[PDB]
């Protein structure tokens, strides 16, 4: 979907506050992919670093961007199958030990010589009451603190 991609590109070309008081393009690449990785895993890291998810239509491949979208389908009791036990919908919650409020993002800083660097981002109000869970991540094409 070159059309979908074009929208996505326009979005990640937006000007956003840099973090050192300047402006900056929202997302940009600057990778140097230097191993054989599985095609789908690579494609997913692209479409994760720019907020979307890759959708194999079955026919084509598009990108559904993680945004408030219109065209919301509706499902109630009269619509989904009713099994023998009267449970149309089953919910299941992520574990508290899996909800994170701090992350170490790894990017490649040109300014201190092009080596890995980590910016820690936390949610203070969340840490204040729900303890303090940290994880890691690598932003995919990242060479800016802002990004």
């Amino acid at each position: 979907d070159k059309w979908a991609l074009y929208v996505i590109g326009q979005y990640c070309d937006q000007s956003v506050p840099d973090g050192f008081g300047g402006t900056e393009p929202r997302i940009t690449c600057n990778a140097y992919l230097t191993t054989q990785r599985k095609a789908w895993d690579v494609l997913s890291d692209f479409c994760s670093a720019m907020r979307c998810m890759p959708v194999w239509n079955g026919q084509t491949l598009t990108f559904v961007q993680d945004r408030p979208s219109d065209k919301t389908w509706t499902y109630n009791r009269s619509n989904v199958v009713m099994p023998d036990d009267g449970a149309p919908f089953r919910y299941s919650f992520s574990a508290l030990k899996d909800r994170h409020n701090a992350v170490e993002v790894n990017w490649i800083d040109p300014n201190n010589g092009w080596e890995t660097a980590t910016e820690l981002v936390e949610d203070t109000q969340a840490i204040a009451r729900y303890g303090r869970n940290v994880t890691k991540m690598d932003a995919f094409g990242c060479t800016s603190r802002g990004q």
């Binding site: 956003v16 993680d66 408030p68």
Partner: peptide, 16 residues
């Protein structure tokens, strides 16, 4: 949770 783009790139206020 639609009002999430707002919360991340605007620092906007949403209540839990």
């Amino acid at each position: 949770v639609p009002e999430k783009e707002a919360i991340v790139d605007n620092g906007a206020h949403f209540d839990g």
